[PDB]
Amino acid sequence: GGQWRLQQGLAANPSGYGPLTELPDWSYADGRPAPPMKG
Amino acid sequence: TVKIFNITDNAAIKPGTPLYAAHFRPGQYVDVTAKTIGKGFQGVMKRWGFKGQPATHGQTKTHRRPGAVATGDIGRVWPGTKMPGKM
Amino acid sequence: FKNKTVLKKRCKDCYLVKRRGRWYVYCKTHPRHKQRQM
Amino acid sequence: TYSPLPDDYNCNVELALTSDGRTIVCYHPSVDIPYEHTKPIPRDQVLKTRLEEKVEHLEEGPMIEQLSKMFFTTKHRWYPHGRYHRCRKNLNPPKDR
Amino acid sequence: FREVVETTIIEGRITATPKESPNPPNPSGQCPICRWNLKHKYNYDDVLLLSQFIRPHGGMLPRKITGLCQEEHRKIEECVKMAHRAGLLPNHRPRQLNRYLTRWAPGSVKPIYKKGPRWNRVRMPVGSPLLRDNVCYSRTPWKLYH
Amino acid sequence: VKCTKARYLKKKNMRTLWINRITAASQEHGLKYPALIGNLVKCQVELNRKVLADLAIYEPKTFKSLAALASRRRHEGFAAALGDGKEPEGIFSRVVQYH
Amino acid sequence: MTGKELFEMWKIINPMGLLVEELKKRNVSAPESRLTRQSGGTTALPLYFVGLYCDKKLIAEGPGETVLVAEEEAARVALRKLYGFTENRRPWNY
Amino acid sequence: SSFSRAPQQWATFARIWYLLDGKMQPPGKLAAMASIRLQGLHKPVYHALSDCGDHVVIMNTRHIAFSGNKWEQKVYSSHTGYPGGFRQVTAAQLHLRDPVAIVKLAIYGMLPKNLHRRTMMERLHLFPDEYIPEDILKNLVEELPQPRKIPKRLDEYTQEEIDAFPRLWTPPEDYRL
Amino acid sequence: SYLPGYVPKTSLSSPPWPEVVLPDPVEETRHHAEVVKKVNEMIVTGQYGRLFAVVHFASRQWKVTSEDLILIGNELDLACGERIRLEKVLLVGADNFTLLGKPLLGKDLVRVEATVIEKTESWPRIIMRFRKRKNFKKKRIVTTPQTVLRINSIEIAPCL
Ligand SMILES: [Mg+2]
Ligand SMILES: [Mg+2]
Ligand SMILES: [Mg+2]
Ligand SMILES: [Mg+2]
Ligand SMILES: [Zn+2]
Ligand SMILES: [Zn+2]
């Protein structure tokens, strides 16, 4: 659905600049934010 | 020997019954099936009636042998090729 | 019949008929004109 | 009166969207088979009833054809294997759940 | 219509006929099909329409009487032959292999003993190039050759 | 040298297996695989083929829910295409925007 | 005890007997066994889904290769449902 | 499902006997769906090494229909390997000799060309007419829908629909017809 | 009286697929509200057990449940036995209901709690390249780092 994602402006690859790929993967159980990911 | 004869339903005879020669009659026509006289392993000369090779005129050890069995292009021998065997 | 690729009418009695998937020129007065499309 | 799919084989699917429009909620309770759709469960004077223990030994051929007819296979599955493969088999395979 | 009776006496008599259905959706059309909005929306199955256009014994009716334009007439003719071969007209007969979409007469085609290479393959005709232009209702066009 | 190329081949074959299983389940629900995948993407659910197959096998009711959602999105797309005007976009055709 | 089945830990002999006892002691009509689903039957690999109903209400279902073992499995499923030690139950809280 | 492990495995991997009807269906479409079922590609647990095929029982194979002129075009070729074993029979001749051969050959062609093909063909069952053996009939589940729709000959049309379809043209009163 | 555009019923006068009419938006919206309320009260009461989730992590999508194990193909900068919260939950479900994110569910709605329990290395992997008649041959042995995480809990909260 690359063309549809482009039409909506959400890249073409769902791994591109979306919240899905840019939000932190995890955090500590008490709530402390995780150190930033390398990618 | 027991042999199986195909009959129509009006020709059934009770099992256990004796059959004799007069079941046939003169001036009739019949077909007779039997195992032919076994000749053992035989060459192409007797089994298939090939012409073989001439005796004299320089021939090396071939007077009673099959010639070419196939052609060059065929990298095999055709099934059903006439070759020596039990006759 | 004669085999032809291009069939031609040579008489005014010649007629074209398509039979068995092929065209034919049949002439009843001049049978030498019988033609079969090839 | 509109259902995305027929509603009579697995579950009663009901789709919904939250008010903010950010998440989809699916309600899928199971569909149970009707009792009406089921079917009921199917159902020497003088001597012992001697147990009828006959086991005719079939030679390998007719044996293998009987097995192949019984299980709808070919004969090759039933023909045996050599010592090389028999020893190559793992007799203590790993087992998860 | 008109019938001729033989008894020697031969006589012609007029029988009742159907007229045109009251209100065509497109009165401006020049051809029965064009007038009822069916140009590309009938197939060999539409034996109702085909029967409206055929003779009692399976023959076609001429254009100058049916009012059909050449293009529609020829499409009717082809559909009628196809339906006859499929056996969808059991009562318009003259005087076992199940078929459908049969373009050629069954007794005039030779078997494909030698299919060609996959680049010059001899294909098997199905359907009709005249009905090529029918409405598709699908994302893949008709396969006129198998 | 095969242990090295078989890595690529393993990835490709696993994806093909997922696609085949997903097609099986989708046809079980009367849907086709392209329709299912495309309409899930349009609905903005980004489950990959691996978990789609996992749900088809182990979570049949959830998979039926997904198939229903995709079928509804397809119907909404057909409705919008036929309308061709400016009718309301459709409940499940709405796009959540991020900034 | 994490990941095992109730009747994998606690062995029982007659699940149908235990089930009818439990239903009787909580005042429920005795279960009726019915053939909900069937595949094969004449072959050597049949599949029988036997459902246990109470008052024409399905209380359990179970598969098997024979009708009797399918019925026994349905009895075990009903026991698991009644005692709450089911597969999809709420997992332990640590 | 709270099933026990062994019955759960049995239920998941059990075989299913599907029924299919010929009777004016294309052999190719019949073969396609039958081959899918025989391979087990319809199951989401499918895998080539899991032996997940299903039984397919096809009936009225004597009454299949070929589109176009396939009855006379399509040629089935075989070779008894003796010099001159090359035989070619049209679809009509093959159907006349054997009423199930055409469907059998189509399914065989569509099956994957590996060592499981003959096992799948062993699970396939074909019958030329309405008669089905009683054990198979007692095994059957799920008659699958037919691919084609049997276009319903003219004499099979009811008077309601016959009169509901408009008449297209007005014939002249003086035409013999 | 035939409408200007009426087509007589033929095999292909109409599309083969059945005609579908979608529910009207207003009644459908109130229906969605009722359904969401029902699922919410199910969550509030607790009429569920053994939740499962589809979670995005390390570029992968995992279908996990409680008491689970997963193997991540890299080091995670975490000491052994450390509790963390998996957050990018694409999906959460149970028996009779499931919740779908677009594409991610709100963190107020669901928590995944996991525990780093092992930090290990993979078995040695072989990379051999060979080209014939050119004397081309290379061998390399690698051991990718790995992290074993145990999924402890999946929790949902009434927020729909
Ligand atoms: Mg001599
Ligand atoms: Mg010498
Ligand atoms: Mg000599
Ligand atoms: Mg790829
Ligand atoms: Zn002439
Ligand atoms: Zn016209």
Structure tokens at D83: 């010592």
Round to whole Å and give the CA distance between A24 and A14: 16
CB atoms within 10 A of CB H133: 12
* DSSP H/E element including H19: strand H17-21
Distance from CA of H122 to the nearest CA of D (A): 6
**Cβ neighbours around E137 below 10 Å, total:** 11
Q: Can you name the residues that pair with E114 across neighbouring β-strands?
A: none
Is the separation of the CB atoms in G65 and G55 below 8 Å?
no
β-pair partners for H125: H57
- Cβ–Cβ < 8 Å for H90, H77: no
Q: Which residues place a Cβ less than 5 A from the ion ligand 1? A: B 52
Contacts 24+ apart (CB under 8 A), H116-122: H116/H48, H116/H53, H118/D74, H119/D72, H119/D73, H119/D74, H119/H53, H120/H35, H120/H38, H120/H39, H120/H53, H121/H38, H122/D68, H122/D72, H122/D73, H122/D74
Question: Kindly report the CA angle at I10 between I6 and I13, in degrees rounded to 5?
Answer: 55
Identify the helix (H) or strand (E) that includes residue F5: helix F2-28
Beta-strand pair G32-39/A26-28 = unpaired
CB contact under 8 A, I33 and D19: yes
Contact (CB<8Å) D40/G35: yes
Helix, strand, or coil here: A7? helix
Q: Are H75 and H88 in contact (CB under 8 A)?
A: yes
Which positions in chain F touch I101 (Cβ < 8 Å)?
45
Could you give the CA distance from residue B31 to residue H138 in angstroms, rounded to a whole number?
49
Looking up tokens 């092929």, which residue turns up? C22
Q: What is the 3-state secondary structure (H, E, C) of B19-76?
A: CCHHHCCCCCCCCCCCCCCCCCEECHHHHCCCCCCCCCCCCCCCCCCCCCCCCCCCCC
Q: How large is the angle between the packed helices F60-83 and F2-28, nearest 10 degrees?
A: 70
Residue E10 neighbours by CB under 8 Å, 6+ apart = E4
Size of the D and F interface in Cβ pairs below 8 Å = 47
Distance separating alpha carbons of residues E34 and E44, to the nearest angstrom: 18
Distance (Å, rounded) from C-alpha D31 to C-alpha I148? 39
Question: Cβ distance G17 to G25 under 8 Å?
Answer: no
With beta carbons less than 8 A apart as the criterion, state whether G31 and G19 touch. yes
Is residue H76 within 8 Å of H60, Cβ to Cβ?
no
Task: Report the phi/psi class of residue F30: left, alpha or beta, with left for phi > 0 and alpha for psi in -120 to 50.
Answer: left
**Nearest chain H Cα distance for residue G24, angstroms:** 23
CATH code of the domain in which H83 resides? 3.90.1180.10
Using CB atoms within 10 Å of the CB of residue H160, give its burial: 0 to 12 exposed, 13 to 18 middle, 19+ buried: exposed
- The partner residues of B85 in beta bridges, in order of sequence, read B42
Burial (CB < 10 A; 0-12, 13-18, 19+), residue G1, is exposed
Tell me if I136 sits within 8 A of I128, measured CB to CB: no
Give how far C4 is from chain E: nearest CA, Å.
19
Contacts of E144 (CB under 8 A, 6+ apart): E125, E126, E127, E128, E129, E132
Q: Which two tokens stand for residue F50?
A: 């691996």
Q: Which residue in I48, I58, I121 sits closest to I84, CA to CA?
A: I58
CA distances from E72 to C15, E64, E77, E131, H165 (A): 27, 13, 9, 10, 19
Which of F99, F92, F11 minimizes the C-alpha distance to F45?
F92
CA–centroid distance, B55 to ligand 2, in Å, is: 15
F91·I93 Cβ contact <8 A:
no
Dmax (CA) for chain A in angstroms is 41
Give the contacts of H65 (CB within 8 A, at least 6 positions apart): E98, E99, E100, H24, H25, H26, H148
CB H66 within 8 A of CB E98: yes
Domain that holds residue H20: 1-177
CA quadruple G7, G10, G16, G21: dihedral sign: negative
Range of G32's domain?
14-88
H95 three-class SS: helix
User: What span, in angstroms and rounded, lies between the C-alpha atoms of E134 and E112?
Assistant: 29
Cα-based distances in Å from G80 to D29, E1, G6, G19, G45: 19, 81, 7, 10, 27
CA-CA-CA-CA torsion sign (E42, E98, H60, H110) = negative
**E48, E97, E103 ranked by CB distance to H165: nearest:** E48
Enter the resolution in angstroms.
3.4
Angle between helices H27-39 and H101-110 (to 10 degrees): 50
Query: Is the Cβ–Cβ distance between G79 and G15 less than 8 Å?
Result: yes
Q: Inspect the interface and report whether the beta carbons of D73 and H119 lie closer than 8 Å.
A: yes
* E100 φ/ψ angles, rounded to the nearest 5 degrees: -165, 155
* H-helix or E-strand spanning residue F62: helix F60-83
When CB atoms are compared, the residue of D10, D15, D30 closest to F72 is D15
Chains H and F touch (3+ CB pairs under 8 A): yes
CB–CB of H116/H44 below 8 Å? no
Provide, as residue numbers in chain I, all residues whose Cβ is less than 8 Å from the Cβ of A31. Answer: 85
Cα distance from F1 to chain A (closest Cα, Å)? 31
Cβ F77 vs Cβ F42: under 8 Å: yes
* Interatomic CA distance for residues D66 and D60, integer angstroms: 10
Beta bridge partners of C7: none
CB-based burial of residue H57 (10 Å sphere; 0-12 exposed, 13-18 middle, 19+ buried)? buried
Cα–Cα distance measured from residue F38 to residue F69, given in angstroms and rounded to the nearest whole number: 12
Cα–Cα distance, H70 to H68 (Å, whole number): 6
Q: How far, in Å, CA of G85 to CA of G62, rounded?
A: 16
Kindly tell me the sign of the dihedral angle through the C-alpha atoms of G61, G67, G72, G75: positive
Whether A5 and chain F come into contact, CB under 8 Å, resolves to: yes
Residues 6+ apart with CB under 8 A from A16: none
Task: State the residue for tokens 């147990």.
Answer: D51
Closest by CA position to E134, among listed H68, I11, H165? I11
The secondary element (H helix, E strand) that includes residue C19 is strand C15-19
Residues shown for chain I: 160
G58-94 in b/e form (b: 16+ CB < 10 A) is bbbbbbbbebebbbbbbbbbbbbebeeebeeeebeee
C-alpha I122/C-alpha I143 separation (Å) is 5
Pick from E64, E99, E103 the residue to mutate for testing the H interface (most H CBs within 10 Å).
E99
What contacts G31, CB < 8 A, 6 or more positions away?
A: G19, G20, G23, G52, G53, G54, G59, G60, G75, G78
Q: How far is CA G36 from CA A21, D36, G32, G48, H151, in A?
A: 48, 10, 12, 8, 37
Percent helix, strand and coil across chain G, each rounded to 5?
35, 25, 40
Cα–Cα dist D23/B6, whole Å: 80
- Residue H164 is inside which H or E element, if any? helix H159-164
Hey, what are F47's tokens?
């489950």
Taking alpha carbons only, the member of E25, C35, E106, A2 closest to residue I1 is E25
Cβ pair I37, I158 in contact under 8 A: no
CB–CB of H107/H34 below 8 Å?
yes
Hey, is the C-beta of E87 within 8 angstroms of any chain H C-beta?
yes
In this structure, what token pair is assigned to residue E21?
A: 């259905």
Q: In terms of residues, how long is chain C?
A: 38
Q: What DSSP line would sit under I33-75, residue for residue? A: HHHHHHHHHHHHHT---S-EEEEEETTEEEEEETTEEEEESS-
- Those residues whose C-beta lies under 8 Å from the C-beta of residue F20, and which sit 6 or more positions away, are H41, H46
Q: How far from chain centre, in Å, is Cα C11?
A: 10
Method: cryo-EM
User: How would you list the strands of the sheet with H17-21, edge to edge?
Assistant: H17-21, H55-59, H124-126
d(CA D40, CA E128): 55
Q: Give the position of tokens 């193997």.
A: I71
Q: Could you give the angle at which helices F60-83 and F49-58 cross, rounded to 10 degrees?
A: 120
Among H23, H63, H177, H162, smallest CA distance to E47 is for H162
Residue I146's φ and ψ, nearest 5 degrees, are -145, 155
C-alpha to C-alpha distances, E117 to A15, H69, H105, H109, nearest whole angstrom: 46, 21, 22, 19
Pairing, β C35-37 against β C2-4 = parallel
Total domain count for chain H?
1
From I57, I58, I54, I62, select the one nearest I89 (Cα to Cα).
Answer: I54
CB H26 within 8 A of CB H66: yes
